[PDB]
Design an enzyme around this catalytic site. Structure first.
Site: not given
Length: 152
Positions: A89-91
């Site tokens: 996840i790109c968070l």
């Protein structure tokens, strides 16, 4: 000692908070006896393309938690600009924006928000980011198809 056990104690406190005040439509907790390895579930948000889907995640807390973020990955396939085939996840809070004030409950909330509002500008899957930007209705349709295909 007390310092060495800081991470463990903090993880226990977070689990107690989560269980006491169950986060809407989500669950998270240790898999077995290792408090540093957890599983979580998120229900696709209502009125999102993901509605009716159930998504499973794996959480691993670092030894120095809460001073470094948990490593979080989806184990259910999902069609989203910021989540890759490996479930990474790109968070921002998982990376550069983590703070020891953040908690698993906050992370789950953030991921739910991410599902509702993708960030196409910082994609992990370029083609999904492109479709989201150029044809939102097509994106919604495909995200729904993937939800039916792999999350139900």
């Amino acid at each position: 000692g007390a310092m060495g056990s800081m991470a463990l104690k903090r993880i226990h406190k977070e689990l107690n908070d989560l269980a006491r005040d169950p986060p809407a439509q989500c669950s998270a907790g240790p898999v077995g006896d290792d408090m540093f390895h957890w599983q979580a579930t998120i229900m696709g948000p209502n009125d999102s393309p993901y509605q009716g889907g159930v998504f499973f995640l794996t959480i691993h807390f670092p030894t120095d938690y809460p001073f470094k973020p948990p490593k979080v990955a989806f184990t259910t396939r999902i069609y989203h600009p910021n989540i890759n085939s490996n479930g990474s996840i790109c968070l921002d809070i998982l990376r550069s924006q983590w703070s020891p004030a953040l908690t698993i409950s906050k992370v789950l909330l953030s991921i739910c928000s991410l599902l509702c509002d993708p960030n196409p500008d910082d994609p992990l899957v370029p083609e999904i980011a492109r479709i989201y930007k150029t044809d939102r209705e097509k994106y919604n349709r495909i995200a729904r198809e993937w939800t039916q295909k792999y999350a139900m």
